[PDB]
Amino acid sequence: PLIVPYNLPLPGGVVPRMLITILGTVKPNANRIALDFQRGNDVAFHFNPRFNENNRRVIVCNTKLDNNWGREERQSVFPFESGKPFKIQVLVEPDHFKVAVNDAHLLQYNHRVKKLNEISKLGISGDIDLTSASYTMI
Ligand SMILES: COc1cccc(CO[C@H]2[C@@H](O)[C@@H](CO)O[C@@H](O[C@H]3[C@H](O)[C@@H](NC(C)=O)[C@H](NC(C)=O)O[C@@H]3CO)[C@@H]2O)c1
């Protein structure tokens, strides 16, 4: 097992056909999970399941530039469950990050940060036990 928050370096940045796979289990009474693809201090893609935002479960995605959050993209389809094991796969495509959870397509996030090769770290945080975090080229 891995210590959370965990930093996964992405050597040379991301590129299309790179597949990141994260395996873990949601804690009991979880509040939030976050994946943060970073370009230095900037967050190119923040993927943030929220377990109780005004008694709703929602995934919020966004980008942070110069310490400012941008326009949120919100998904009400919510495949995570407190206490249960999950798999998140993020496939870098030419125009977007493509996210699947437990083998089912979830969402796509169009590239706002376009210098893909400068997105050099992935932070994994929140209310999880982290089992593995890896990448491969498909
Ligand atoms: C909770 O713990 C941590 C730890 C590290 C980093 C964060 C960053 O969390 C922020 C991030 O998820 C951004 C993504 O857009 O949202 C921030 O929250 C927003 C919130 O989503 C907005 N809610 C709505 C309903 O629009 C709110 N909007 C208004 C008008 O207030 O704005 C906040 C602040 O940007 C979240 O803090 C978290």
CA 14 to chain centre: 14
SS percent in the chain: helix, strand, coil, step 5: 0, 60, 35
CA distance 1 to 131: 5
Q: Which of 69, 75, 125 to mutate to test the pocket of ligand 1 (most atoms within 8 A of CB)?
A: 69
Q: DSSP string spanning 65-96?
A: ETTEE---EEE------TT-EEEEEEEE-SSE
Range of the domain at 24: 1-138
CB 59 within 8 A of CB 107: yes
Ligand 1 centroid–CA 114 distance in Å is 23
> Residues with Cβ < 8 Å from 130, sequence gap 6 or more?
1, 2, 3, 4, 6, 22, 23, 24, 124
| The total number of structural domains that make up the chain | 1
Domain of 128: which CATH number?
Answer: 2.60.120.200
Ligand 1 centroid–CA 130 distance in Å is 23
- Closest-CA residue, ligand 1 atom 25, reads 53
CB 60 within 8 A of CB 71: no
CB 57 within 8 A of CB 73: no
- Closest-CA residue, ligand 1 atom 17, reads 69
Experiment type: X-ray
- CA-CA distances (angstroms) from residue 25 to 10, 31, 98, 132? 23, 13, 21, 10
Is 50 annotated to bind ligand?
Answer: no
CA distance 61 to 119: 16
Resolution (A): 1.6
